[PDB]
């Protein structure tokens, strides 16, 4: 139905990804939601824990997949998740990577964000719909943050 569960999750994911991309692209606003406060903290924390690997994958991605960043990104996301139990940590890694892309892009030029956020929303809100719901939605992410 209109604004079903999948729709609400997709929209929420989309705007969370638009926030983090903005956050990494030199924009400074208070977090628009609790989930955004959580992601900004956890995604940047994960970046510092692996800065060279994310920066290296990001540069390679930009230098290889300029033709269509979206379809490469879909593959990257699948490989970030891998074959094991999915978890909020894996989800965070998706945001981290895309935020590093966004910042490296701005150091070089400028706006693929619109493309990137939708691609994230389609993958998590669409493909991984079942895991997201099973794990409480973005509310469950906020709980994961308030105990991490």
Author numbering: 1 to 110, 113 to 150
Please share excerpts from the published article on this structure.
NRZ is a 19 kDa protein expressed in the epiboly of the extra-maternal yolk syncytial layer (YSL) of zebrafish eggs. In vivo, NRZ has been shown to be a potent inhibitor of apoptosis after serum withdrawal, and controls development during somatogenesis and gastrulation.
In summary, like other pro-survival Bcl-2 protein structures solved to-date, NRZ adopts a Bcl-2 like fold and its most closely related structural homologs are the cellular apoptosis inhibitor Mcl-1 and the canarypox viral Bcl-2 protein CNP058. Comparison of the backbone structures of NRZ and NRZ: zBad BH3 complex. a Cartoon representation of apo NRZ (light blue) superimposed onto NRZ: zBad BH3 complex (green). Here we examined the structure and interactions of NRZ by determining the structures of apo-NRZ and its complex with zBad BH3, the orthologue of mammalian Bad and measuring the binding affinities for BH3-motifs. The structures revealed the conformational changes in NRZ after binding of BH3 motif ligand and provide a structural basis for NRZ mediated apoptosis inhibition.
